[PDB]
Design a protein around this nucleic acid. Sequence first.
RNA 1: GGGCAGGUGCCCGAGCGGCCAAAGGGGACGGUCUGUAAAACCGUUGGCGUAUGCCUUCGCUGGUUCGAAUCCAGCCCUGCCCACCA
RNA 2: GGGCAGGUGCCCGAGCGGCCAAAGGGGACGGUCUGUAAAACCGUUGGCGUAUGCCUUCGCUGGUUCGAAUCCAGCCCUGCCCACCA
Lengths: 425, 425
Amino acid sequence: GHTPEEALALLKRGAEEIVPEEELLAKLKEGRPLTVKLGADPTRPDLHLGHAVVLRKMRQFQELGHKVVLIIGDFTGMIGDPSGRRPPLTLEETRENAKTYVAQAGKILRQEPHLFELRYNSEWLEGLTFKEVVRLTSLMTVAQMLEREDFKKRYEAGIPISLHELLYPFAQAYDSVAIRADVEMGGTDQRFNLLVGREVQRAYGQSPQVCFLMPLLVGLDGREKMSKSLDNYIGLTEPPEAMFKKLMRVPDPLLPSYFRLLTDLEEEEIEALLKAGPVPAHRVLARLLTAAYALPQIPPRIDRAFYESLGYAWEAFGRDKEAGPEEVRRAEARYDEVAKGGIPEEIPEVTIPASELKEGRIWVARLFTLAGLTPSNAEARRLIQNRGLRLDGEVLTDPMLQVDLSRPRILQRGKDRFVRVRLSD
Amino acid sequence: GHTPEEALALLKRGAEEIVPEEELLAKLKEGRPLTVKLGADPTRPDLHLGHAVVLRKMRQFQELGHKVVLIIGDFTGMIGDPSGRRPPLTLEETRENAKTYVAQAGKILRQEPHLFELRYNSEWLEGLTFKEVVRLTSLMTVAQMLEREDFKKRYEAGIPISLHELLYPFAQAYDSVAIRADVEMGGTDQRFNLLVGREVQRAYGQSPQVCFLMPLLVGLDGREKMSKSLDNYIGLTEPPEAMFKKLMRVPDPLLPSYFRLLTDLEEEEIEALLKAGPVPAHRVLARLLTAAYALPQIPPRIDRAFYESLGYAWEAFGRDKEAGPEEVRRAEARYDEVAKGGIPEEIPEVTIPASELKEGRIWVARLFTLAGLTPSNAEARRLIQNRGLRLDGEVLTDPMLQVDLSRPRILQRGKDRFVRVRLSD
RNA sequence: GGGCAGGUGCCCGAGCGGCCAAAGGGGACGGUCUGUAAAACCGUUGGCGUAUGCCUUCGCUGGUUCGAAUCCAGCCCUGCCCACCA
RNA sequence: GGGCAGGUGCCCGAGCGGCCAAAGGGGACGGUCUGUAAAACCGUUGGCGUAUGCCUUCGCUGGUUCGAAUCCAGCCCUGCCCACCA
Ligand SMILES: [Mg+2]
Ligand SMILES: [Mg+2]
Ligand SMILES: [Mg+2]
Ligand SMILES: [Mg+2]
């Protein structure tokens, strides 16, 4: 139901760069399903909303009739860094992690075969001969390859670059040859390797792939890209209660990009939400995405129609807190209840064996560590000095307190981490 | 008949560097035939006295009971430079060139199997998998590999380095792993790649090879290394007449190195020859080597005993021109006859068809080109202006001369190139 | 994927419309003197049988011009510089 | 194959025998004020149930010393610099 020009315009929204854009228009006019490549690193199988930026653009390709080929990078996943300057995965860890990745990616991507194929690049890379590897690497010079920013910066700074790292752009580029990619997806940070793909496809007599680059989502800290290692992320499989709370804590300046990169709202609708204020805009964002990722798969369009289909009223601009799917309504209620200093209805339970007692009690610092709220008794003590711990809703001021557990106690660390502890022989 | 220490001392003579030298002593004390590697590039199968420096050291290893493994580099010979920034050999040109190389190398190397094996590195390189190649290249960093002088100089100068060129040191190093090399031979200009061999052998759990580096022989120009492309070389298969003349024209300052790198004369004997004067020293050098390379194989020791076995007297210091093998005596006589302005007894004949005539004659410039002495009539004319051409022993002063060929004529270009021309329908 | 600059004779490299088979350095080649060496000095370093000429010639293919190695356009390869940078 | 220098806390990085769980910048974490936001301000940023203490702590393994993150030795990895350069 879209002309090629309409399809290009839909696809352009949110993108940092489509290159060459005119080539994508030509491919869209061929009236055939385009092969849309995404390489996935099996060593990092847990997806977050940052990964969803590219994956939802791929879903849009699929809704337009194009075919995702998801390439698990098990070849390099099983080699890793053989020098040491992440460890290598076993064949079992590789299929396990691939399974996790595909399961989470399927919360976004269509899975019908005509729209989706899973491949493992070991299928074709394991057999690539030395001679073919030499001829592949001859396609670029040393100076050309050192232009990539992490090579240039490390080299000029005296930080080691393993020479095998110069082979990996060619493996990724060969993956494009192996599947005859029409488009390769990536974040902006993959631009160089995607361009190498074009060069390698030309050398193999193929049409060079369009490189389709999405911006990187910034994390909850407000400065750095969302990433697992920076602990600033929102995972696609986090419980609705936690996803909703994290989305309410997205720094205000990031709201436009979250709406543009994670929903399909029109720019006029986004502006209308921001005019209602930052907290209203947050509630709408959190409801949309918490709902979408609570489903087994996000809808084809996370848009105003989807919002109203959940039971919310657009013209209420966040005030209609009692509507929505039960999972979302409850999550939002918990957020507000915790905000005004209340204790939520359901909190995690940790049963503590009687063997942990000492003179019939448990030192409060060690109790928090046993409950999993603190990593050490020393840290529990420091948090008490900083008024960061509560017991039964009272701020702890005595770091020597010995806690009576003859009835369950409610422990709290910071703003919203609660554990109810009770004794059990 | 040599202790390990005696063997090391023999081997050290002429060498620029044995590294680690103490490791070679340890290997010699094992009392077993050591595997002595030489890689040979099949694209350059014609050998000259420069190649003889390394090859004669290998012969000395063989005379001490050690085993040469001669590795034809047909893998890289058949790939070449796939970018273009020498062309690739066909499988037929590769075996043909290998045949030429081995034939000439056998003028120096023993050929018994226990002392000599021929291998082609395609035997093991063609099958090296991509995974193994990645792990090989991980053994060095970019900065380490760019230390090699031609990489550092080209990179700093903005001269292209094809990235596949960074793979070739690993292929050469893997060849050492494949044959379990104890020693790898090379000129000083191969020091870096030989050291990479050590590093790769260690990674494969092998004893790292001793790197055995010979200096490079300087050519007849007196400055540059002897090499085919600089036209300053003496080929191992040149006719005795020409080898003898070229050896008489070795610049005086190179005499010590030619004696050290190409003969086994003692330093005392070499000094005694130089004391007799440069021309006497030249005659002895030219007789020794012309004789040695006129044989189907050089003797185990090109030394004073070998000299006297040819019929010459050491104490004559070159004056005994009438002695020696017929081939040498005749070559030396030709040299002296040409020197004093005579025409040699036997000169090449070129028969010229009558169709080349013009008004019953041939313009002298075109005659020299037809005889193969000049590459163009223009050059023949320039040489006449420079008094570089003779006809029947007279210096040509008329560049318009039309030559009568009703009897054979003797043409001369420069000092010692002669062609007798005669007509033939 | 974007920009700029470069590719010239045996090599490096200059060339800013004619003075260009082309500066300068190097190399090689011929000769003198000899030792078939070096040095020093002089010469040579696209081709063509009638020359006041013809052919070809500066990465490739075209173009403006009486005339292009030079200026213009498209292309090839390279270098630097962008892009990428969390 | 040879030389020198480097590797420190969440990160960068200082440390020149004790003043070192360790400068400075950054990050993160707790709290106030709130909007479970930012800002600003104050605090925190090896472990240990009795603490004036104990354990562990600056690439690895040892050593000098009352005492080593610091000095010494051997080793690992890296960077620069050699070697290689025709
Ligand atoms: Mg570019
Ligand atoms: Mg470009
Ligand atoms: Mg080194
Ligand atoms: Mg070293």
